[PDB]
């Protein structure tokens, strides 16, 4: 009436919960790159010679 060893298991199942990968879009930056410093339009000379 006691507990005895039974037949060895024939296989093992290991369960884990996993989600999946999306598409590669690689959206690097809101406003991207190093935007260049640049000329103010027209500007004009702010200096003249004497005479």
């Amino acid at each position: 009436g006691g507990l005895t060893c039974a037949s060895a298991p024939q296989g093992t199942l290991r369960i884990l919960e996993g989600p999946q990968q999306s598409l590669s879009g690689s959206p690097l930056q809101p406003i991207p790159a190093s935007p260049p410093p640049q000329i103010p339009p027209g500007l004009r000379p702010r200096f003249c010679a004497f005479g």
Partner: protein, 63 residues
């Protein structure tokens, strides 16, 4: 005399200072695929990675 010994952090770098629960993490790692240190790795202990979480070895995510 202090060269290379006294450094300074970059502008974006930062030190972590918050403390969190980190108690539901060992139970999530097992849902993800880790097998607890107790047993049944499902491979050979050589084709398995030893998982650690803050000094405490959760144990042996498959390779």
């Amino acid at each position: 005399e202090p060269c290379g010994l006294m450094n300074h952090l970059t502008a974006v770098c930062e030190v972590v200072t918050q403390f969190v629960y980190t108690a539901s993490i060992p139970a999530l790692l097992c849902n993800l695929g880790v097998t607890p240190i107790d047993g049944a790795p499902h491979r050979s202990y050589s084709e398995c990675y030893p998982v650690l979480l803050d000094g405490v070895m959760v144990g042996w995510v498959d390779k």
